[PDB]
Design a protein around this ligand. Structure first.
Ligand SMILES: [N+]
Length: 172
DNA sequence: TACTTCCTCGGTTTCATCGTCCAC
DNA sequence: GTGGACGATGAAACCGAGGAAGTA
């Protein structure tokens, strides 16, 4: 019936946002709500379709090695292939998500950071469906400080697989 | 067939932002 | 008055259930 939303593997143009989502099918992990093997992994949103394709390629390389099926040949990812080896799978996926277009929108380049009225300072906020709160994390003089606060709250309320503005290792 | 792998996009959650409260 | 602390709102991200697309 319908033509595929993207010419690339693992890329779906979202019907409402118009963003190119990268996603991945983990055929080895176990879906526990179902019985069967298989889990959908969301890699992020990208304003550029080619960027979502590259994101899929890199995540697939981290999951299945240099001859899994790729939108582009593994020779184009040689450098990334080495860097990939130095981190967890979760660390690498968090990094891929951190570079994505949808990670942070608006004025600040950091997620959870926006500006306190017109005071020239930066508020950090974080969302928590438990308690139905948009928690306030303070006002800071630099975006990096606000982003640090957002990060700390993020690791606290999301633990592992928490995507932070700055590297998870900064907070050990 | 039946069965696995992959895509889609609607609920759900969270952010970006701006404007409002109240304890000082 | 007022200014941190937040709440309201709309935009936009997140993400799996489910159906579509390949297998074999
Ligand atoms: N967007």
């Amino acid at each position: 019936s319908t033509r595929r939303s993207s010419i690339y593997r693992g890329v779906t143009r979202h019907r409402w946002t118009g963003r190119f989502e990268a996603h991945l099918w983990d055929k080895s992990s176990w879906n526990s709500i179902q019985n069967k093997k298989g889990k959908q992994v969301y890699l992020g949103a990208y304003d550029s379709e080619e960027a979502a394709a590259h994101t899929y390629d890199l995540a697939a390389l981290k999951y299945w090695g240099p001859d899994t099926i790729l939108n582009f040949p593994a020779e184009t990812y040689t450098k990334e292939l080495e860097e990939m080896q130095r981190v967890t799978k979760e660390e690498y996926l968090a990094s891929l998500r951190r570079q994505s277009s949808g990670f942070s929108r608006g004025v600040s380049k950091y997620r959870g950071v926006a500006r306190h009225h017109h005071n020239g300072r930066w508020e950090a906020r974080i969302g928590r469906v438990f308690g139905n709160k948009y928690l306030y994390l303070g006002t800071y003089n630099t975006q990096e400080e606000a982003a640090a606060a957002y990060d700390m709250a993020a690791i606290e309320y999301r633990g592992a697989n928490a995507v932070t503005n700055f590297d998870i290792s900064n907070y050990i």
